[PDB]
């Protein structure tokens, strides 16, 4: 009763606690070993930064039971506005002691006012300064401290390991993890503190700096004592948003902390942090759903972007089944980047808006439910730092503003991103409500959230551990596992970092957690470490535990290599995931830790693995894994040699292939995979299997695991995209097996015969095997082939249907809703002149059909599986979607047929048959099935910008062209600095963002989308908005786009008010006519706008809506008029054969021969004669414009100045190119024509026009000697550092030829004096080799200025 201490007891220990404060005196374990707590009278409580010392009258004590005691603390300071009652609970269980603040009463406050209003006198922070919950002393045997801080740098360890001596002097030294050891015992301190502090290396905030342990020294008699305390906790924190508005937000959780007292837990004869770390796992926080991390063998990204629907949800399900077959059903983790709105970096932050063009919530749920049966987990990429006007969440309160009241702008790509006010988004309840929108759609089907960019200070200048803890909680609360971008981010709750798992990003300073303490504790719970990437060195030179190496094949960054993806899983990820099924128990001889980098007391042993690195791991069933390094010397070949043993038996040996792709290795393995792909439980003894991989290929012998020792044979299968193949029966002798393996080819070994994994291709897709993933077999089992020709499944990467000759491939459609409208589109690449068709039939009769001739438009969709960098045939891909529209019949009998009509040897490629509900009905036909009219308001587009297809103005790219969406007033002209409307009519339009001065086609129609019949006339009209005069133009062409062979009509400015465009088109003789939008060489008028206003303004954009194409009546002609028009055309051009190209003459002869076929056919009608006449009239207007083009190149070479001005007014192209790609400006600079050049530049000449050799007019002006031209060109916008085909800049050419006045003008205008050509020479070196010492000294003084 009068004793000032009490005793709490477990079967493992007894603890003495003080009655006057929640303090521990000492811990005595059953074996009599003692660990101190706080031996001194320290009674400090910190509230809001103020230390208050408690007296006897301020604390009441109550012993609840032998395992619990409650304290009531009166914490008061009148001057500092503090009057609180803190209730503290101390509990014990086994070797653990917990200290929890169970109640905080504020006498100076009524609470947080509604809507997170400011709470006056709020208790914001709380801590117990120098509480010393556990402590060690310099007088104890082997007294030491081990701490961990965050390091994303592969060369800089995050740990510290040192002896606790009399000289040890620390005060609130903060660590993420801290362990003390001494006198046979070890202990770590766990706290849920959101404090941010000291770190070794991290490129971002976002919870990277969470340090929860405070170490402090004090004198305890003759010895120095190092004690561990929790870092401060946040309770009711007051925060400010970007508008200066203040809020008080409640605690993420009440304050909690604990210790777990360990002895020699790993039984190695030493007591250090590793023993304390094993015990620490019993009290530490565990990220939500981290128990599934070892199962996630196949990580990857499935991408969608810019309305294209490159990867609809039911195609992602098929790719899951493809990877399930190739890995024998190992678990997967698919990150849906672009799951929402129009795709990746569209619709942020509308989390609940699942992409309608991908199949919406219904298809996403089917994909997730069915995918889970194959062990596949799904998660979505979200953004809580940047938003777009189109997002319904976009509001003025959501907008982040700067100290001046302006928008805090983000990235402009498809649309202009605007930063989100992170503090408003949290304190208002907005973010949590958008996550709830998503929760309603996905239910409990979705596994994880991938939070992009969090920590890069885009949402606020803070994004601390308190904000990240609250962010992870609202995510975890919906049943979602937390994953994020940056390698160092979110130490507390993230189970994956993209910049840790994808080792190619960021470089050696910006990777995953480089800590032995952190990886020892949590390797099995996260893919947030450093894997093999030797060029980074240090932690990245063959880590013994491996580390996730992530690749992709579904469009992310153009990644499409399926074979490289599978090869990579087996090279690094199968062994990394195997190692994660065990927990580290011992880790000695770490070469990265030395006395120089603060780790003098790091855990060593010369009796283990020759004093070289070794790690021991164990599971809860006592299975032991030992991973050993061949040598600790990085100059030895054995540094990268690793052996893995499972229960004393070698299961892996050798050097892995460098994770950076730089060197193949020699590693082989025979890994026992004992777990299912769901919760990771042990599969039944007979279902147990081994994975075999041999890097170089060859024959290796292995000892099978114990439970296989009595088998007399095993079954070995080669794994392919079709599953288990080439079954071999291999004999077992003395429990050993010999395996012959091809290089980098996976095999799976079973005890007996194994069945194939059951795969029903394309579930929910209305057709079986829509993506041609079923091998050659699919053309017998699923699709029916008929005809004299040939049908085959071709392509080693993304398999396709390839047709040759006359053949039909058909399949019955299932699960259609009778009477509903459907669109059916299929990707087609036709290399034959004969038609390739898609047809839907019902009971023998055709409901819908469409055809394409030879494909004329290459595919430039980076995230798409068949873009022109993927080699469909001949190093190119012309894949474009071909549509048919039909109403599902009441009979329920519908069949799709893909066919090649012609009997020639050329190929037709088809892939991805997609049947989707669609309400589009804008196409009207004539009786002959030809086009009567096509209208499109873009309100019912199944995907992409149909009837247009994206062109090559940016190469294979995540094209800055997409379907723009309405969200007034934010998307309309007038909001902020925005001058253009995103949408013209309805909710959707086609938008081009900032593609000015490309001098090429932006997008175009193609014959399979809209077919223009030879000779027929069409009226084309549309509504548009264009940011400047003449930046974009209407282009009309025939066949594959070629510069010079298209008709251009510049479009006038329509900025904020919708313009109307209309023109006529006569179809070319080959049925391949098209129209589109072209980016000219004309500079936009930015109207004095600066910075982000240049992009957000709309000055460089182009919006198109309400497209209307209609066949019009042309004036009727007789056969006589048609024939007379032939004589008239032949009279104008037959003589000009010499004046024409050998291909221009063939195009003229082609048209003429074809028009004569119309006139002279037996039974020709007035329609044929009118078509023949209209074709010749179009041929006339073409040959006439081509003549004015070569007459302009003739008048710019010889310098007839007045001919040049009249020719451009008559129609001649200012950018006419000769056979060497030379424009009239290239001829007016090489010949010196000042007046010609200026008028040309005003007209719209490309100042940076490159010829066949990349030579610009500025290159020619500098290489000849015209200073008048140089000043004009530089004023117009000539690129002073433009490089030709040999890397030569104009400065290189001026110095090489001998032009002193030129080198000075170029240098003044910004010429890079240290620019290297292809032979490494700079402009200075070119002067020395030619005898221009006077030029050389001018460039030498410029280089060192």
């Amino acid at each position: 009763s009068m004793v000032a201490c009490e005793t709490l007891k477990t079967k493992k220990m007894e603890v003495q606690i003080k009655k006057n404060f929640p303090s521990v005196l000492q811990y005595t374990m059953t074996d009599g070993k003692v660990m101190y707590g706080q031996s001194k009278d320290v009674r400090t409580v910190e509230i809001n930064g103020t230390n208050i010392e408690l007296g006897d009258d301020d604390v009441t004590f109550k012993k609840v039971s032998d395992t619990e005691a409650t304290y009531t603390l009166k914490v008061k300071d009148e001057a500092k506005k503090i009057d609180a009652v803190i209730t503290v609970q101390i509990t014990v269980k086994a070797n653990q002691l917990h200290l929890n603040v169970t109640k905080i009463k504020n006498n100076l406050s009524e609470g947080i006012p509604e809507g997170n209003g400011v709470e006056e006198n709020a208790i914001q922070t709380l801590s117990f300064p120098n509480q010393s919950l556990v402590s060690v002393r310099s007088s104890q045997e082997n007294a030491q401290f081990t701490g961990a801080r965050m390091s994303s740098n592969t060369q800089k360890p995050g740990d510290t390991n040192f002896a606790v001596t009399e000289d040890t002097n620390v005060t609130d030294s903060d660590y993420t993890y801290g362990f003390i050891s001494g006198a046979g015992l070890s202990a770590g301190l766990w706290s849920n503190s959101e404090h941010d502090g000291t770190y070794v290396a991290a490129p971002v905030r976002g919870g990277s700096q969470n340090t929860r342990v405070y170490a402090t020294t004090q004198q305890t008699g003759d010895a120095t004592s190092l004690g561990l305390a929790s870092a401060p906790w946040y309770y009711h924190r007051t925060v400010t948003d970007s508008k200066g508005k203040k809020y008080t937000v409640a605690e993420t959780a009440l304050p909690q902390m604990a210790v777990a007292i360990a002895g020699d837990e790993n039984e190695d004869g030493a007591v250090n942090w590793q023993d304390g770390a094993i015990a620490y796992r019993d009290i530490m926080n565990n990220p939500y759903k981290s128990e599934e991390v070892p199962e996630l063998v196949a990580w990857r990204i499935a991408m969608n972007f810019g309305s294209q629907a490159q990867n609809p949800f039911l195609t992602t399900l098929d790719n899951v089944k493809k990877v399930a077959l190739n890995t024998d059903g190992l678990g997967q983790s698919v990150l849906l980047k672009g799951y929402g709105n129009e795709g990746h970096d569209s619709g942020h932050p509308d989390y609940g808006d699942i992409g309608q063009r991908l199949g919406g919530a219904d298809d996403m749920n089917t994909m997730m439910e069915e995918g889970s049966k194959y062990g596949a987990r799904f998660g979505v990429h979200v953004n809580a730092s940047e938003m777009y006007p189109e997002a319904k969440a976009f509001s003025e309160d959501m907008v982040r503003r700067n100290s001046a009241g302006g928008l805090s702008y983000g990235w402009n790509w498809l649309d202009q991103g605007v930063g989100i006010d992170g503090i408003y988004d949290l304190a208002s309840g907005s973010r949590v409500s958008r996550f709830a929108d998503l929760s309603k759609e996905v239910g409990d089907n979705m596994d994880f959230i991938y939070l992009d960019v969090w920590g890069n200070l885009t949402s606020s200048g803070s994004e601390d551990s308190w904000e990240t803890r609250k962010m992870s909680k609202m995510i975890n609360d919906n049943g979602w596992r937390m994953t994020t971008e940056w390698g160092s981010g979110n130490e507390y709750d993230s189970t994956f970092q993209h910049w840790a798992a994808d080792l190619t990003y960021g470089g050696y300073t910006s990777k995953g957690e480089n800590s032995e303490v952190m990886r020892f504790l949590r390797n099995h719970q996260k893919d947030s470490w450093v894997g093999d990437y030797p060029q980074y060195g240090g932690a990245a030179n063959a880590p013994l535990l491996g580390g996730y190496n992530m690749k992709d094949f579904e469009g992310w960054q153009g990644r499409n290599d399926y074979a490289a993806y599978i090869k990579n899983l087996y090279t690094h990820d199968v062994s990394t995931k195997f190692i994660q099924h065990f927990k580290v128990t011992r880790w000695v001889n770490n070469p990265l830790l030395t006395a120089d980098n603060g780790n003098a007391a790091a855990v060593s042993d010369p009796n283990t693995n020759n004093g070289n690195e070794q790690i021991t791991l164990k599971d809860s069933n006592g299975n032991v894994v030992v991973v050993s390094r061949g040598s600790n010397d990085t100059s030895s070949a054995a540094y990268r040699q690793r052996t893995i043993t499972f229960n004393g038996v070698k299961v892996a040996s050798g050097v892995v292939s460098a994770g950076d792709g730089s060197a193949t290795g020699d590693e082989s393995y025979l890994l026992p995979w004992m777990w299912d792909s769901f919760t990771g439980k042990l599969v039944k003894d007979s279902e147990q299997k081994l994975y075999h991989w041999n890097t170089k290929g060859g024959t290796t012998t292995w000892t099978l695991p114990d439970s296989w020792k009595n088998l007399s044979s095993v079954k070995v299968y080669q794994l392919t995209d079709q599953g288990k193949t080439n079954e071999q029966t291999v004999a077992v002798s003395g429990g050993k097996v010999t395996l012959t393996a091809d290089a980098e080819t996976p095999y799976v070994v079973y005890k007996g015969e194994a069945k194939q994994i059951q795969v029903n291709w394309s579930e929910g897709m209305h057709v079986v095997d829509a993506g041609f993933n079923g091998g050659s077999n699919t053309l017998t089992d699923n699709w029916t082939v008929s005809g004299s020709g040939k049908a085959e499944v071709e392509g080693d990467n993304n398999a396709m249907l390839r047709l040759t000759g006359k053949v039909d491939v058909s399949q019955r459609l299932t699960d259609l809703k009778a009477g509903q409208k459907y669109a059916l589109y299929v990707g087609v690449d036709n290399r034959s002149t004969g038609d390739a068709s898609v047809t839907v039939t019902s009971g023998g009769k055709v409901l819908a059909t469409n055809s394409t001739g030879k494909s004329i438009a290459k595919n430039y969709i980076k995230a798409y599986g068949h873009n022109t960098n993927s080699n469909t045939e001949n190093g190119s891909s012309y894949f474009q979607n071909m549509y048919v529209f039909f109403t599902a019949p009441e009979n329920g009998d519908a069949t799709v047929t893909l066919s090649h009509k012609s009997t020639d040897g050329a190929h037709t490629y088809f892939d991805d048959v997609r049947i989707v509900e669609n309400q589009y009905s804008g196409i009207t036909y004539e009786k002959d099935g030809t086009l009567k009219s096509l209208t499109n308001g873009f309100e019912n587009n199944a995907q992409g910008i149909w009837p247009f297809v994206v062109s090559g103005s940016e190469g294979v790219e995540d094209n800055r062209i997409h379907l723009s969406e309405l969200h007034a007033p934010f998307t309309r002209a007038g909001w902020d600095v925005k001058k253009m409307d995103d949408v013209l009519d309805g909710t959707w339009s086609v938008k081009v963002n900032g593609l000015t001065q490309k001098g090429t086609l932006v997008y175009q129609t193609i014959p399979q989308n809209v077919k223009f019949e030879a000779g027929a006339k069409y009226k084309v009209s549309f509504d548009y908005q264009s940011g400047s005069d003449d930046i974009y133009a209407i282009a009309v062409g025939q066949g594959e786009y070629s510069a010079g062979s298209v008709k251009l009509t510049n479009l006038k400015k329509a900025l904020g008010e919708t313009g109307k465009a209309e023109f006529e088109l006569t179809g070319g003789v080959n049925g391949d006519s098209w129209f589109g939008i072209y980016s000219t060489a004309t500079a936009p008028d930015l109207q004095g706008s600066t910075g982000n206003a240049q992009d957000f303004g709309g000055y460089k954009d182009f919006v198109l809506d309400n497209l209307k194409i209609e066949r019009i009546e042309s004036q009727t002609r007789t056969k006589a008029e048609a024939q007379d028009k032939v004589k008239e055309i032949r009279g104008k051009y037959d003589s000009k054969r010499a004046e024409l190209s050998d291909a221009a003459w063939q195009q003229y002869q082609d048209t003429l021969v074809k028009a004569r076929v119309l006139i002279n056919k037996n039974g020709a009608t007035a329609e044929d004669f009118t078509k023949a006449y209209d074709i010749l009239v179009a041929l006339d207007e073409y040959m006439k414009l081509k003549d004015l083009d070569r007459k302009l190149l003739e008048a710019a070479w010889v310098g007839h100045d007045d001919e040049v001005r009249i020719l451009m007014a008559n129609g001649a192209d200012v950018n006419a190119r000769d056979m060497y790609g030379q424009t009239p400006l290239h001829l007016a600079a090489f010949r010196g024509h000042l007046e010609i050049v200026e008028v040309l530049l005003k007209t719209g000449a490309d100042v940076n026009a490159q010829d066949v050799t990349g030579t610009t007019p500025l290159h020619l002006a500098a290489a000849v000697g015209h200073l008048d031209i140089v000043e004009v060109l530089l004023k117009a916008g000539a690129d002073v550092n433009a490089q030709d085909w040999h890397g030569e800049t104009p400065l290189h050419l001026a110095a090489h030829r001998g032009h002193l006045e030129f080198v000075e003008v170029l240098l003044k205008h910004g010429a890079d004096v240290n620019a290297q050509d292809c032979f490494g020479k700079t402009p200075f070196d070119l002067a020395i080799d030619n005898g221009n010492e006077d030029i050389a000294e001018v460039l030498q003084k410029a280089a060192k200025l």
Binding site: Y1220, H1226, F1230, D1251, T1253, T1255, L1260, A1263, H1296
Partner: peptide, 9 residues
């Protein structure tokens, strides 16, 4: 003519 190599001596 092709001006690329004319420019170069």
């Amino acid at each position: 003519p092709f001006l690329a190599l004319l420019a170069a001596x």
